[PDB]
Design a protein around this ligand. Structure first.
Ligand SMILES: Cc1onc(-c2ccccc2Cl)c1C(=O)N[C@@H]1C(=O)N2[C@@H]1SC(C)(C)[C@@H]2C(=O)O
Lengths: 123, 472
């Protein structure tokens, strides 16, 4: 709960490492995901990391190659983007979903309940 | 071919091999299908997987009830195999992304899983009982060899399933995405082939008819027996010499004897779920133990996960070895293994295997330095002795249990006792789930605990097996 984010401008072919720290209940309880919202577009799926980090998923695009990692101590989550391009110069959000039983896709906006403010990574 | 072995068991062992091949090939990819095709939560995927496994373990009760109480077997096998094929068709149809999405996929997959569980629970006991029914009651020595070959076929199917499954889901694009339809359809074709080969031998089988609504008669007999003693303010002869003797105003002696044998065998089997639960807690902890020990082996680098395949291979080696050499050598002398001493010896071997695992963990912990490498870092070897002991226990226990269940069952309820044998596995698997969450002990102290528990269960089973009254 109370998720945050951090990031900024990157080189045309550089790399970025976005943070997401939860300042609420324990971080091991929530399933986490990353979303992006390019200007004048719809919020897209980027990557998802399950509680305990055992299961990971990335969007078909995954421009370059992403990597989502999390530690449940200090409640922090890292996204490593490698081969960013002029495109995907979007606002990146962090979403957290409390563990429960559901049939909704883990890669959809409806699966997650709390969204933090998004960074403004640009290329 | 020559004699003493009908040609029919060919299309029993082959059918079992194909069925296990398909079942394991599907179950291997089930979780990945849940996670990366349906995009389900980890909790939801794991819960659905465990529910499907539990239903598969528990459905043989219904299958055996159908078979023995009505329709006989070879007609429950055929119809439940048709249901199995329908479930496979539904499951493979729900993995096609072209038609529907996220609603048709889920519904079709769940319905297919339900049908697959129904089919497996009802092809499991019925097939074994039907194959055992092909031998004359006098040929009690060929039946044991047939059961050994049956277990060998099961294990071989599992092994080829492990060796062949990763190829199906390896860089295959069904329609622009990972090809799960092929992964779920190849097992469907395997099950279709198994059904075809089983049905091909119809004219050679020895189909015996059911002896009536045996399950209802058994339930009613037990109910009357229990309700007769309730002489709260009276009673001179409610029941003496047994708790079923004075359930004799009805239910002629030929039924009271059958229910007596059933109850005796069930009371004997009571403690087997604990043995199954204790023995199941080795495919997960031993992987962790392997993760802490060197696995180069000089010639070929072995991963901790790959060591799991050493169980079916050792079973394949041991079954012929036990059947043809060790048992024959024991029989050479006056030593008599009565098919209940075999199970106790298997329990003792499992306890020894877990004690050896605890010893290996203790050796691992005692590591001291001389990228630095610990001198006292064990190679992936030293896990063989516990894999050898645990595998021998499984061969001695599981193979003997199938024969003991059939040999000690009344002709009217031969497949009911086979469901009782599988019922212990179902209950034992339930115990594993309840105990899995509770994990706060050291690996060495956990293995020593399992060894002691396996010893306590062995003594309980040994004492009860000592007082067991064999069927006659
Ligand atoms: C234990 C046990 O209890 N009933 C059976 C059994 C008996 C008949 C048909 C199918 C099965 Cl799975 C059984 C058993 O171990 N069967 C077979 C056996 O042993 N193998 C299969 S299952 C397995 C893949 C886990 C195991 C292995 O390869 O390690």
């Amino acid at each position: 709960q109370l998720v945050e984010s951090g990031g900024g401008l990157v080189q045309p072919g550089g790399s970025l490492r976005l943070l997401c720290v939860a300042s609420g209940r324990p971080f091991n309880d929530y399933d986490m995901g990353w979303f992006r919202q390019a200007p004048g577009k719809e919020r897209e799926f980027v990557a998802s990391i399950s509680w305990s980090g055992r299961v990971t998923d990335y969007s078909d695009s995954m421009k370059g190659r992403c990597t989502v990692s999390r530690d449940n101590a200090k409640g922090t989550m890292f996204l490593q983007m490698s081969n960013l391009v002029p495109r995907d110069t979007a606002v990146y959000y962090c979403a957290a979903a409390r563990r429960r039983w559901t049939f909704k896709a883990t890669n959809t906006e409806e699966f997650y309940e709390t969204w933090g403010q998004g960074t403004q990574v640009t290329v | 071919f020559g004699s003493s072995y009908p040609v029919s068991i060919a299309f029993i062992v082959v059918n079992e091999f194909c069925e296990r091949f398909s079942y394991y090939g599907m179950k291997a990819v089930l979780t990945l299908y849940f996670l990366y095709f349906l995009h389900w939560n980890e909790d939801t995927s794991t819960s659905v997987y465990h529910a499907f496994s539990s239903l598969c373990y528990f459905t043989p009760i219904l299958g055996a009830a159908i078979a023995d109480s009505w329709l006989g077997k070879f007609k429950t096998i055929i119809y439940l195999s048709l249901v199995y094929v329908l479930g496979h068709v539904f499951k493979s149809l729900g993995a096609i992304p072209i038609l529907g999405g996220k609603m048709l996929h889920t519904i079709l997959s769940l319905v297919g899983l339900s049908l697959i569980a129904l089919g497996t629970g009802g092809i499991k006991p019925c097939v074994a009982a039907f194959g055992g029914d092909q031998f004359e009651e006098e040929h009690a020595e060929a039946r044991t060899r047939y059961f050994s070959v049956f277990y060998l076929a099961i294990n071989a199917g599992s092994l080829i399933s492990t060796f062949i499954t990763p190829m199906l889901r390896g860089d295959v694009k069904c329609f622009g995405q990972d090809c799960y339809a092929l992964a779920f359809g190849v097992p469907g074709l395997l099950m279709v082939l198994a059904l075809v080969v089983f049905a091909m031998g119809s004219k050679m089988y020895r189909k015996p008819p059911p002896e009536g609504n045996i399950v209802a008669q058994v339930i009613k007999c037990i109910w009357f027996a229990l309700c007769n003693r309730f002489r709260n303010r009276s009673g001179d002869l409610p029941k003496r010499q047994h708790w079923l003797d004075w359930a004799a105003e009805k239910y002629p002696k030929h039924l009271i004897a059958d229910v007596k044998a059933l109850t005796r065998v069930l009371f004997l089997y009571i403690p087997l779920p604990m043995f199954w639960a204790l023995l199941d807690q080795q495919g997960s902890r031993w992987t962790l133990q392997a993760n802490k020990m060197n696995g180069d082996l000089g010639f070929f680098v072995l991963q901790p996960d790959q060591m799991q395949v050493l169980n079916p291979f050792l079973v394949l080696i041991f079954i012929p070895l036990f059947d043809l050499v060790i048992y024959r050598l024991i029989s050479k002398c006056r030593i008599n293994f009565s098919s209940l001493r075999k199970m106790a010896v298997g329990m003792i071997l499992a306890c020894l295997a877990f004690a050896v695992a605890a010893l290996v963990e203790t050796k691992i912990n005692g590591m001291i330095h001389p990228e630095d490498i610990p001198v006292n870092k064990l190679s992936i070897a030293w896990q063989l002795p516990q894999y050898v002991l645990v595998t021998a226990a499984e061969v001695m226990f599981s193979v003997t249990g199938l024969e003991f269940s059939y040999s000690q069952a009344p002709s009217s309820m031969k497949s009911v006792l086979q469901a009782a044998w599988l019922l212990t596995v179902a209950v034992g698997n339930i115990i594993v789930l309840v105990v899995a969450q509770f994990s706060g002990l050291a690996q060495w102290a956990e293995f020593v605990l399992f060894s002691c528990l396996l010893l306590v269960v062995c003594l309980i089973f040994s004492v009860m097996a000592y007082y067991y009254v064999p069927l006659k």
